[PDB]
Amino acid sequence: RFLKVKNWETDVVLTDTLHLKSTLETGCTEHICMGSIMLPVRTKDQLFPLAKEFLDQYYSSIKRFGSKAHMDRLEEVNKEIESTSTYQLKDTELIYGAKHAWRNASRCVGRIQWSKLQVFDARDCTTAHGMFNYICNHVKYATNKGNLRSAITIFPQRTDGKHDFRVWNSQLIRYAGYKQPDGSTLGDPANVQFTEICIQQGWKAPRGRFDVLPLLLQANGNDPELFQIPPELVLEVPIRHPKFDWFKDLGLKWYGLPAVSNMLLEIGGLEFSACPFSGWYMGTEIGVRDYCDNSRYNILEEVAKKMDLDMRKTSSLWKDQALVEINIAVLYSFQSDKVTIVDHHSATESFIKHMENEYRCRGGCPADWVWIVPPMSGSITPVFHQEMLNYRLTPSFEYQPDPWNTHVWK
Amino acid sequence: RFLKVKNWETDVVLTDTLHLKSTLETGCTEHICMGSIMLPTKDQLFPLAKEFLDQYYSSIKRFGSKAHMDRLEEVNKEIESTSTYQLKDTELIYGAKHAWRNASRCVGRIQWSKLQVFDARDCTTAHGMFNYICNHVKYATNKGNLRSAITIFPQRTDGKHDFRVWNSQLIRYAGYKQPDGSTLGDPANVQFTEICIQQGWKAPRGRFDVLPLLLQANGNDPELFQIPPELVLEVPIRHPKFDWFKDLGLKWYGLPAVSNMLLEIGGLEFSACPFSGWYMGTEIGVRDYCDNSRYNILEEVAKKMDLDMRKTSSLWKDQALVEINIAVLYSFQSDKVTIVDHHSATESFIKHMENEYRCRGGCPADWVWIVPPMSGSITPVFHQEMLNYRLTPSFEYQPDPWNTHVW
Ligand code: HEM
Ligand code: HEM
Ligand SMILES: C[C@H](O)[C@H](O)[C@H]1CNc2nc(N)[nH]c(=O)c2N1
Ligand SMILES: C[C@H](O)[C@H](O)[C@H]1CNc2nc(N)[nH]c(=O)c2N1
Ligand SMILES: CCCC(=[NH2+])NCCC[C@H](N)C(=O)O
Ligand SMILES: CCCC(=[NH2+])NCCC[C@H](N)C(=O)O
Ligand SMILES: [Zn+2]
């Protein structure tokens, strides 16, 4: 079956066939669309076919499909699964797997960079201290003094589900949030629960507005342990504005390395529950969402006041005006400090080119419109006008429940 | 099943059961979601009619009553004998209001019950249509104090006597392909504009020429008519600070009236059902004015603001965008012409959504269309999960008449 996708701005129509290889469900039925819904131990049986599917794709990609090497590997894995209930991926297969989970991530607008990914094999890791060392190395390599490099560190795969490796932090670098008795919040509201766990686990919180959280790491299913990231490894950018000299006095700053650490990487049926990965920020993530979401730093008013905008009525679009200035400030500061970052215009224009390229060479590009379109200036970015098809391909990155809700304490 | 919807900003959760009453397909499947796709017999009729009459009588607290039963049989006998049926005035009004209520892509449905319905089912000629339309335009405009309304022309019979308003909107600007290769006016209407010329209209070749109405009655060929200039309210666009703005020579019409859709009520199809409300600022300022394939004015405005257009990272497009939208809202409000900003409108929709969830069990909404084209996440709807599904009565898209008409 062929599915057409049209761009209402250029009239360019594309044809998708890749979706035919979609296996997982979407949450939508022929009667209801759940497109705007945030989030709608395997057995030997359902494992080998998943392993086979993957190996077929791997060998096909290297132009060795049907080869003796291809056939022996399948036999090798089958024997391994029947003999151990699981199997180990070759280094090359792991790299290939990691790159494709990224390539297949329908909610990522930065996939034009999918082939450039440094993969760190941490499958020989056995303890929390070990994980800490691996994570420090990842942070330093990826930061690269501001010239960010995409990377991912892969810890031991899940086995019986009782010895899972997990990074309890949602991101390797993030600011603490503290609920005050008066009901207000100091720091990042998004991380209040995790901050409370860190404190309960022994962390001495400086209780400031931008405290870098400590790492809470779980190795081989054991109770998590706290570690402080060497401060000198944490690159941060003070936020100032090119024209507004009072902006810097708002006391704002952010970290330069965005690294998602709470997702699950699925490759050939295997589950990698600890797989922190990082790239670089698209400006709006910080300037629109992290700073202006009502449930995040919520700085719109305070900024609007200093600009002395007419905040008496919404029709003055004072929120919209303050929003642009803030985002101008984020880009300006990062560029000035020579810390990699991309604005939403460049990022979306690149995605459209990546997407068209993918349709031609791969026959498709699963994309979540709701997530791809930036949180500000939507229609003035090309992705807004682009029809998209969302479906799930493996390898992939999946959400997984927060560990404190499932962990069996020892 | 019973689906739940969460607002990630307020944590508030709502349970949807109304979707269980959906009937038409969504275009999506368990393997693929098409949420961002602009457009994914007597035996067939009675069940549809029954479904409608049932919900109607239920709304008037007379479900299962003799009246309910009587009406059901009357319509039943009418379909069997005449292969179709006529709605009572009360059923027509209820149907139109509910089509709006069910329009998943409309952010202003909190106003759904306040709709003036003009029954034009007695219309027989194109001239009759023109008269009905002028009256609608005048009633809705109301000297700037806009009132929502819809005019319903005769329903479909054998598909060969369909009433159609060829225009996409009652009021819209023409577009012409110039020698330069460029386009004069609204690119979105180039094609329709040519069918008018190709039909007789004497295009003024301007940047903002109000198009003539191309009305089709009883399947006959469409006729042209000029909407009385004095009935077309327009607003010259100026900025409250940039005195140079007025020089861009921009203006827009005050009455947004969709006229190319099809109204479905109890199986019956009303192929000519122009309806109107009032504008939400961004529709004009963001889409009509800045869409690359529309008036595409960003650069011009940017230049006059004197900002660094050298690099995209200076966000000159975003700055210019905000100003253009401040100007649209400013002008309409200055001339006392009804208009709502995206902040106010989305806040209202969230309120409506909550009312609909507790009183009706849900509210079908298309996130992709509900979220404004600018400042997405600073509006509450961005953080509001929404379930999209089709409920009838409904407003449907339909083929442009010139691709089906047999002259
Ligand atoms: C090179 C820089 C990159 C840019 C500019 C980019 C940009 C983005 C943005 C803007 C989002 C949405 C984030 C949000 O709203 O929370 C996103 C999501 C995502 N990206 Fe990328 N990305 C980059 C690299 C990567 C890398 C290295 C990976 C994986 C190896 C990746 C995997 C994903 C995934 C899985 C999501 C969805 C996360 C979620 O559901 O919260 N991205 N990306
Ligand atoms: C009174 C104020 C109203 C407001 C502020 C409002 C606002 C909106 C907006 C912002 C859109 C999207 C327009 C676009 O992107 O092209 C829309 C679409 C729509 N509205 Fe409303 N609306 C109003 C009245 C009405 C009325 C009176 C009806 C029906 C009787 C209605 C039916 C629809 C339909 C069917 C759509 C989708 C149109 C399409 O698919 O192009 N609206 N509305
Ligand atoms: C409810 C809705 O799904 C939610 O607010 C989504 C919308 N689009 C998004 N897009 C991105 N990139 N990131 C997000 O967190 C969201 N949140
Ligand atoms: C391709 C995509 O569906 C298309 O650009 C949609 C996006 N959201 C929209 N939302 C509204 N209100 N109006 C539109 O015309 C669109 N266009
Ligand atoms: C790993 C990918 C890099 C990236 N651009 N974004 C990750 C999510 C970051 C999150 N949106 C934030 O503002 O912190
Ligand atoms: C009839 C509904 C009222 C309304 N706000 N919009 C209809 C579509 C208008 C179209 N988006 C425009 O900018 O002209
Ligand atoms: Zn869907």
mmCIF file with all atom_site columns, N, CA, C and O and ligand atoms in Angstrom, chain B residues 100 106-108 148-149 168-169 171-172 186 252-253 255-259 274-285 287-289 294 340 369, ligand 6:
data_model
loop_
_atom_site.group_PDB
_atom_site.id
_atom_site.type_symbol
_atom_site.label_atom_id
_atom_site.label_alt_id
_atom_site.label_comp_id
_atom_site.label_asym_id
_atom_site.label_entity_id
_atom_site.label_seq_id
_atom_site.pdbx_PDB_ins_code
_atom_site.Cartn_x
_atom_site.Cartn_y
_atom_site.Cartn_z
_atom_site.occupancy
_atom_site.B_iso_or_equiv
_atom_site.pdbx_formal_charge
_atom_site.auth_seq_id
_atom_site.auth_comp_id
_atom_site.auth_asym_id
_atom_site.auth_atom_id
_atom_site.pdbx_PDB_model_num
ATOM   1   N N  . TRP B 1 100 ? -21.653 22.471 14.323 1.00 0.00 ? 100 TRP B N  1
ATOM   2   C CA . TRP B 1 100 ? -20.641 23.388 14.853 1.00 0.00 ? 100 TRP B CA 1
ATOM   3   C C  . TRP B 1 100 ? -20.067 22.780 16.123 1.00 0.00 ? 100 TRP B C  1
ATOM   4   O O  . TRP B 1 100 ? -18.848 22.682 16.286 1.00 0.00 ? 100 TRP B O  1
ATOM   5   N N  . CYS B 1 106 ? -12.494 23.562 15.210 1.00 0.00 ? 106 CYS B N  1
ATOM   6   C CA . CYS B 1 106 ? -12.902 24.913 15.597 1.00 0.00 ? 106 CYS B CA 1
ATOM   7   C C  . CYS B 1 106 ? -12.583 25.217 17.051 1.00 0.00 ? 106 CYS B C  1
ATOM   8   O O  . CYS B 1 106 ? -13.058 24.532 17.952 1.00 0.00 ? 106 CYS B O  1
ATOM   9   N N  . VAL B 1 107 ? -11.796 26.262 17.277 1.00 0.00 ? 107 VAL B N  1
ATOM   10  C CA . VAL B 1 107 ? -11.410 26.650 18.626 1.00 0.00 ? 107 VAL B CA 1
ATOM   11  C C  . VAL B 1 107 ? -12.443 27.547 19.324 1.00 0.00 ? 107 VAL B C  1
ATOM   12  O O  . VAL B 1 107 ? -12.350 27.797 20.525 1.00 0.00 ? 107 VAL B O  1
ATOM   13  N N  . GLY B 1 108 ? -13.429 28.027 18.573 1.00 0.00 ? 108 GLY B N  1
ATOM   14  C CA . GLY B 1 108 ? -14.421 28.910 19.156 1.00 0.00 ? 108 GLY B CA 1
ATOM   15  C C  . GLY B 1 108 ? -15.772 28.293 19.454 1.00 0.00 ? 108 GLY B C  1
ATOM   16  O O  . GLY B 1 108 ? -16.777 28.997 19.488 1.00 0.00 ? 108 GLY B O  1
ATOM   17  N N  . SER B 1 148 ? -22.721 35.342 14.935 1.00 0.00 ? 148 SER B N  1
ATOM   18  C CA . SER B 1 148 ? -22.592 34.106 14.176 1.00 0.00 ? 148 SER B CA 1
ATOM   19  C C  . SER B 1 148 ? -23.900 33.733 13.496 1.00 0.00 ? 148 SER B C  1
ATOM   20  O O  . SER B 1 148 ? -24.981 33.918 14.060 1.00 0.00 ? 148 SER B O  1
ATOM   21  N N  . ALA B 1 149 ? -23.785 33.203 12.278 1.00 0.00 ? 149 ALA B N  1
ATOM   22  C CA . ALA B 1 149 ? -24.937 32.787 11.508 1.00 0.00 ? 149 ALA B CA 1
ATOM   23  C C  . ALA B 1 149 ? -24.596 31.772 10.414 1.00 0.00 ? 149 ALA B C  1
ATOM   24  O O  . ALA B 1 149 ? -23.434 31.575 10.053 1.00 0.00 ? 149 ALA B O  1
ATOM   25  N N  . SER B 1 168 ? -14.882 29.969 -1.841 1.00 0.00 ? 168 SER B N  1
ATOM   26  C CA . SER B 1 168 ? -14.454 29.200 -0.675 1.00 0.00 ? 168 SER B CA 1
ATOM   27  C C  . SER B 1 168 ? -14.935 29.941 0.587  1.00 0.00 ? 168 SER B C  1
ATOM   28  O O  . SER B 1 168 ? -15.189 29.334 1.624  1.00 0.00 ? 168 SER B O  1
ATOM   29  N N  . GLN B 1 169 ? -15.059 31.261 0.471  1.00 0.00 ? 169 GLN B N  1
ATOM   30  C CA . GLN B 1 169 ? -15.551 32.117 1.548  1.00 0.00 ? 169 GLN B CA 1
ATOM   31  C C  . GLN B 1 169 ? -16.430 33.173 0.872  1.00 0.00 ? 169 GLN B C  1
ATOM   32  O O  . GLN B 1 169 ? -16.140 33.581 -0.255 1.00 0.00 ? 169 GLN B O  1
ATOM   33  N N  . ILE B 1 171 ? -16.677 36.248 1.389  1.00 0.00 ? 171 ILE B N  1
ATOM   34  C CA . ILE B 1 171 ? -15.842 37.411 1.123  1.00 0.00 ? 171 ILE B CA 1
ATOM   35  C C  . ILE B 1 171 ? -14.378 36.982 1.069  1.00 0.00 ? 171 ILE B C  1
ATOM   36  O O  . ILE B 1 171 ? -13.860 36.404 2.026  1.00 0.00 ? 171 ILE B O  1
ATOM   37  N N  . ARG B 1 172 ? -13.732 37.246 -0.065 1.00 0.00 ? 172 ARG B N  1
ATOM   38  C CA . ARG B 1 172 ? -12.318 36.927 -0.268 1.00 0.00 ? 172 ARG B CA 1
ATOM   39  C C  . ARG B 1 172 ? -11.716 37.765 -1.404 1.00 0.00 ? 172 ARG B C  1
ATOM   40  O O  . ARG B 1 172 ? -12.422 38.197 -2.314 1.00 0.00 ? 172 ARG B O  1
ATOM   41  N N  . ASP B 1 186 ? -4.232  37.651 -3.595 1.00 0.00 ? 186 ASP B N  1
ATOM   42  C CA . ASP B 1 186 ? -4.170  36.428 -2.804 1.00 0.00 ? 186 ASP B CA 1
ATOM   43  C C  . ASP B 1 186 ? -3.924  35.200 -3.674 1.00 0.00 ? 186 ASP B C  1
ATOM   44  O O  . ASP B 1 186 ? -4.798  34.773 -4.430 1.00 0.00 ? 186 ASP B O  1
ATOM   45  N N  . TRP B 1 252 ? -7.938  44.090 5.626  1.00 0.00 ? 252 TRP B N  1
ATOM   46  C CA . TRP B 1 252 ? -8.592  42.784 5.586  1.00 0.00 ? 252 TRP B CA 1
ATOM   47  C C  . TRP B 1 252 ? -10.087 42.954 5.863  1.00 0.00 ? 252 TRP B C  1
ATOM   48  O O  . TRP B 1 252 ? -10.511 43.969 6.414  1.00 0.00 ? 252 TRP B O  1
ATOM   49  N N  . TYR B 1 253 ? -10.884 41.967 5.467  1.00 0.00 ? 253 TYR B N  1
ATOM   50  C CA . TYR B 1 253 ? -12.331 42.034 5.672  1.00 0.00 ? 253 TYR B CA 1
ATOM   51  C C  . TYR B 1 253 ? -12.691 41.544 7.062  1.00 0.00 ? 253 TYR B C  1
ATOM   52  O O  . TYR B 1 253 ? -11.999 40.697 7.627  1.00 0.00 ? 253 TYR B O  1
ATOM   53  N N  . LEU B 1 255 ? -15.633 39.996 8.039  1.00 0.00 ? 255 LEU B N  1
ATOM   54  C CA . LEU B 1 255 ? -16.472 38.809 8.145  1.00 0.00 ? 255 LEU B CA 1
ATOM   55  C C  . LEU B 1 255 ? -15.922 37.503 7.566  1.00 0.00 ? 255 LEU B C  1
ATOM   56  O O  . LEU B 1 255 ? -15.864 37.324 6.347  1.00 0.00 ? 255 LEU B O  1
ATOM   57  N N  . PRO B 1 256 ? -15.506 36.575 8.442  1.00 0.00 ? 256 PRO B N  1
ATOM   58  C CA . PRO B 1 256 ? -14.977 35.287 7.978  1.00 0.00 ? 256 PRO B CA 1
ATOM   59  C C  . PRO B 1 256 ? -16.176 34.357 7.777  1.00 0.00 ? 256 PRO B C  1
ATOM   60  O O  . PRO B 1 256 ? -16.863 33.998 8.738  1.00 0.00 ? 256 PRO B O  1
ATOM   61  N N  . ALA B 1 257 ? -16.440 33.983 6.530  1.00 0.00 ? 257 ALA B N  1
ATOM   62  C CA . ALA B 1 257 ? -17.587 33.134 6.232  1.00 0.00 ? 257 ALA B CA 1
ATOM   63  C C  . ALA B 1 257 ? -17.280 31.971 5.287  1.00 0.00 ? 257 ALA B C  1
ATOM   64  O O  . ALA B 1 257 ? -17.242 32.136 4.062  1.00 0.00 ? 257 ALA B O  1
ATOM   65  N N  . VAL B 1 258 ? -17.067 30.796 5.874  1.00 0.00 ? 258 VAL B N  1
ATOM   66  C CA . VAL B 1 258 ? -16.766 29.579 5.132  1.00 0.00 ? 258 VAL B CA 1
ATOM   67  C C  . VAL B 1 258 ? -17.980 29.179 4.312  1.00 0.00 ? 258 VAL B C  1
ATOM   68  O O  . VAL B 1 258 ? -19.058 28.957 4.860  1.00 0.00 ? 258 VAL B O  1
ATOM   69  N N  . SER B 1 259 ? -17.812 29.062 2.997  1.00 0.00 ? 259 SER B N  1
ATOM   70  C CA . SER B 1 259 ? -18.948 28.727 2.148  1.00 0.00 ? 259 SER B CA 1
ATOM   71  C C  . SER B 1 259 ? -18.820 27.523 1.223  1.00 0.00 ? 259 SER B C  1
ATOM   72  O O  . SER B 1 259 ? -19.725 27.274 0.432  1.00 0.00 ? 259 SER B O  1
ATOM   73  N N  . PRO B 1 274 ? -23.262 28.311 3.719  1.00 0.00 ? 274 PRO B N  1
ATOM   74  C CA . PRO B 1 274 ? -22.302 29.282 4.235  1.00 0.00 ? 274 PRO B CA 1
ATOM   75  C C  . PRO B 1 274 ? -22.547 29.657 5.704  1.00 0.00 ? 274 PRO B C  1
ATOM   76  O O  . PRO B 1 274 ? -23.674 29.941 6.099  1.00 0.00 ? 274 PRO B O  1
ATOM   77  N N  . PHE B 1 275 ? -21.487 29.637 6.507  1.00 0.00 ? 275 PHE B N  1
ATOM   78  C CA . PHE B 1 275 ? -21.591 29.994 7.914  1.00 0.00 ? 275 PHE B CA 1
ATOM   79  C C  . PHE B 1 275 ? -20.481 30.973 8.268  1.00 0.00 ? 275 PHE B C  1
ATOM   80  O O  . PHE B 1 275 ? -19.429 30.986 7.623  1.00 0.00 ? 275 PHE B O  1
ATOM   81  N N  . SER B 1 276 ? -20.728 31.806 9.279  1.00 0.00 ? 276 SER B N  1
ATOM   82  C CA . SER B 1 276 ? -19.758 32.801 9.689  1.00 0.00 ? 276 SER B CA 1
ATOM   83  C C  . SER B 1 276 ? -19.759 33.063 11.187 1.00 0.00 ? 276 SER B C  1
ATOM   84  O O  . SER B 1 276 ? -20.761 32.840 11.866 1.00 0.00 ? 276 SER B O  1
ATOM   85  N N  . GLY B 1 277 ? -18.617 33.544 11.681 1.00 0.00 ? 277 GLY B N  1
ATOM   86  C CA . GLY B 1 277 ? -18.462 33.880 13.090 1.00 0.00 ? 277 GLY B CA 1
ATOM   87  C C  . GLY B 1 277 ? -17.657 35.163 13.096 1.00 0.00 ? 277 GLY B C  1
ATOM   88  O O  . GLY B 1 277 ? -18.092 36.172 12.548 1.00 0.00 ? 277 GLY B O  1
ATOM   89  N N  . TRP B 1 278 ? -16.489 35.134 13.723 1.00 0.00 ? 278 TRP B N  1
ATOM   90  C CA . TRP B 1 278 ? -15.606 36.288 13.725 1.00 0.00 ? 278 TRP B CA 1
ATOM   91  C C  . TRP B 1 278 ? -14.184 35.761 13.830 1.00 0.00 ? 278 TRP B C  1
ATOM   92  O O  . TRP B 1 278 ? -13.954 34.632 14.263 1.00 0.00 ? 278 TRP B O  1
ATOM   93  N N  . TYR B 1 279 ? -13.240 36.582 13.406 1.00 0.00 ? 279 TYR B N  1
ATOM   94  C CA . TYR B 1 279 ? -11.828 36.221 13.386 1.00 0.00 ? 279 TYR B CA 1
ATOM   95  C C  . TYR B 1 279 ? -11.079 36.113 14.687 1.00 0.00 ? 279 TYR B C  1
ATOM   96  O O  . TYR B 1 279 ? -11.372 36.822 15.646 1.00 0.00 ? 279 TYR B O  1
ATOM   97  N N  . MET B 1 280 ? -10.094 35.216 14.691 1.00 0.00 ? 280 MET B N  1
ATOM   98  C CA . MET B 1 280 ? -9.164  35.072 15.800 1.00 0.00 ? 280 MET B CA 1
ATOM   99  C C  . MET B 1 280 ? -7.979  35.723 15.086 1.00 0.00 ? 280 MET B C  1
ATOM   100 O O  . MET B 1 280 ? -7.670  35.366 13.946 1.00 0.00 ? 280 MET B O  1
ATOM   101 N N  . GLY B 1 281 ? -7.354  36.697 15.735 1.00 0.00 ? 281 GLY B N  1
ATOM   102 C CA . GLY B 1 281 ? -6.253  37.443 15.136 1.00 0.00 ? 281 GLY B CA 1
ATOM   103 C C  . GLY B 1 281 ? -5.238  36.750 14.247 1.00 0.00 ? 281 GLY B C  1
ATOM   104 O O  . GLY B 1 281 ? -4.967  37.211 13.140 1.00 0.00 ? 281 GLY B O  1
ATOM   105 N N  . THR B 1 282 ? -4.670  35.650 14.725 1.00 0.00 ? 282 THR B N  1
ATOM   106 C CA . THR B 1 282 ? -3.652  34.923 13.979 1.00 0.00 ? 282 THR B CA 1
ATOM   107 C C  . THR B 1 282 ? -4.052  34.431 12.597 1.00 0.00 ? 282 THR B C  1
ATOM   108 O O  . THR B 1 282 ? -3.192  34.282 11.725 1.00 0.00 ? 282 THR B O  1
ATOM   109 N N  . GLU B 1 283 ? -5.340  34.172 12.381 1.00 0.00 ? 283 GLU B N  1
ATOM   110 C CA . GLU B 1 283 ? -5.780  33.687 11.080 1.00 0.00 ? 283 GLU B CA 1
ATOM   111 C C  . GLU B 1 283 ? -5.347  34.651 9.990  1.00 0.00 ? 283 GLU B C  1
ATOM   112 O O  . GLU B 1 283 ? -4.945  34.237 8.899  1.00 0.00 ? 283 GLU B O  1
ATOM   113 N N  . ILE B 1 284 ? -5.440  35.941 10.293 1.00 0.00 ? 284 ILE B N  1
ATOM   114 C CA . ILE B 1 284 ? -5.078  36.972 9.334  1.00 0.00 ? 284 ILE B CA 1
ATOM   115 C C  . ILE B 1 284 ? -3.607  37.336 9.451  1.00 0.00 ? 284 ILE B C  1
ATOM   116 O O  . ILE B 1 284 ? -2.852  37.250 8.478  1.00 0.00 ? 284 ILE B O  1
ATOM   117 N N  . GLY B 1 285 ? -3.208  37.736 10.651 1.00 0.00 ? 285 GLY B N  1
ATOM   118 C CA . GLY B 1 285 ? -1.836  38.154 10.882 1.00 0.00 ? 285 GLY B CA 1
ATOM   119 C C  . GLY B 1 285 ? -0.758  37.119 10.650 1.00 0.00 ? 285 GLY B C  1
ATOM   120 O O  . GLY B 1 285 ? 0.316   37.432 10.115 1.00 0.00 ? 285 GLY B O  1
ATOM   121 N N  . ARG B 1 287 ? -1.338  33.533 9.304  1.00 0.00 ? 287 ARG B N  1
ATOM   122 C CA . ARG B 1 287 ? -1.577  32.749 8.098  1.00 0.00 ? 287 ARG B CA 1
ATOM   123 C C  . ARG B 1 287 ? -1.824  33.511 6.785  1.00 0.00 ? 287 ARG B C  1
ATOM   124 O O  . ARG B 1 287 ? -1.085  33.330 5.817  1.00 0.00 ? 287 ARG B O  1
ATOM   125 N N  . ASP B 1 288 ? -2.858  34.347 6.742  1.00 0.00 ? 288 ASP B N  1
ATOM   126 C CA . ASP B 1 288 ? -3.178  35.070 5.512  1.00 0.00 ? 288 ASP B CA 1
ATOM   127 C C  . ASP B 1 288 ? -2.084  36.044 5.079  1.00 0.00 ? 288 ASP B C  1
ATOM   128 O O  . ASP B 1 288 ? -1.796  36.171 3.889  1.00 0.00 ? 288 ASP B O  1
ATOM   129 N N  . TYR B 1 289 ? -1.468  36.707 6.053  1.00 0.00 ? 289 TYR B N  1
ATOM   130 C CA . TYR B 1 289 ? -0.412  37.684 5.803  1.00 0.00 ? 289 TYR B CA 1
ATOM   131 C C  . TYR B 1 289 ? 1.014   37.151 5.682  1.00 0.00 ? 289 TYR B C  1
ATOM   132 O O  . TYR B 1 289 ? 1.793   37.650 4.863  1.00 0.00 ? 289 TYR B O  1
ATOM   133 N N  . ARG B 1 294 ? 0.857   32.859 0.675  1.00 0.00 ? 294 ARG B N  1
ATOM   134 C CA . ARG B 1 294 ? -0.259  33.789 0.791  1.00 0.00 ? 294 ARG B CA 1
ATOM   135 C C  . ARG B 1 294 ? 0.292   35.176 0.489  1.00 0.00 ? 294 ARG B C  1
ATOM   136 O O  . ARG B 1 294 ? 1.047   35.329 -0.471 1.00 0.00 ? 294 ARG B O  1
ATOM   137 N N  . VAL B 1 340 ? -10.872 38.261 18.203 1.00 0.00 ? 340 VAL B N  1
ATOM   138 C CA . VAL B 1 340 ? -10.344 37.691 19.441 1.00 0.00 ? 340 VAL B CA 1
ATOM   139 C C  . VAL B 1 340 ? -8.888  37.258 19.261 1.00 0.00 ? 340 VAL B C  1
ATOM   140 O O  . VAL B 1 340 ? -8.525  36.718 18.213 1.00 0.00 ? 340 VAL B O  1
ATOM   141 N N  . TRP B 1 369 ? -5.033  21.556 14.571 1.00 0.00 ? 369 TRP B N  1
ATOM   142 C CA . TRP B 1 369 ? -5.758  22.750 14.135 1.00 0.00 ? 369 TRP B CA 1
ATOM   143 C C  . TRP B 1 369 ? -6.097  23.724 15.270 1.00 0.00 ? 369 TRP B C  1
ATOM   144 O O  . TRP B 1 369 ? -6.155  24.934 15.050 1.00 0.00 ? 369 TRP B O  1
HETATM 145 C C1 . LIG C 2 .   ? -16.695 30.662 9.970  1.00 0.00 ? 6   LIG C C1 1
HETATM 146 C C2 . LIG C 2 .   ? -15.765 30.629 10.912 1.00 0.00 ? 6   LIG C C2 1
HETATM 147 C C3 . LIG C 2 .   ? -15.011 31.848 11.399 1.00 0.00 ? 6   LIG C C3 1
HETATM 148 C C4 . LIG C 2 .   ? -13.455 31.797 11.343 1.00 0.00 ? 6   LIG C C4 1
HETATM 149 N N1 . LIG C 2 .   ? -12.778 32.320 12.364 1.00 0.00 ? 6   LIG C N1 1
HETATM 150 N N2 . LIG C 2 .   ? -12.670 31.257 10.362 1.00 0.00 ? 6   LIG C N2 1
HETATM 151 C C5 . LIG C 2 .   ? -13.016 30.571 9.078  1.00 0.00 ? 6   LIG C C5 1
HETATM 152 C C6 . LIG C 2 .   ? -11.792 30.305 8.251  1.00 0.00 ? 6   LIG C C6 1
HETATM 153 C C7 . LIG C 2 .   ? -11.114 31.649 7.957  1.00 0.00 ? 6   LIG C C7 1
HETATM 154 C C8 . LIG C 2 .   ? -9.733  31.609 7.301  1.00 0.00 ? 6   LIG C C8 1
HETATM 155 N N3 . LIG C 2 .   ? -8.836  30.879 8.240  1.00 0.00 ? 6   LIG C N3 1
HETATM 156 C C9 . LIG C 2 .   ? -9.166  33.054 7.045  1.00 0.00 ? 6   LIG C C9 1
HETATM 157 O O1 . LIG C 2 .   ? -8.123  33.455 7.619  1.00 0.00 ? 6   LIG C O1 1
HETATM 158 O O2 . LIG C 2 .   ? -9.792  33.818 6.273  1.00 0.00 ? 6   LIG C O2 1
#
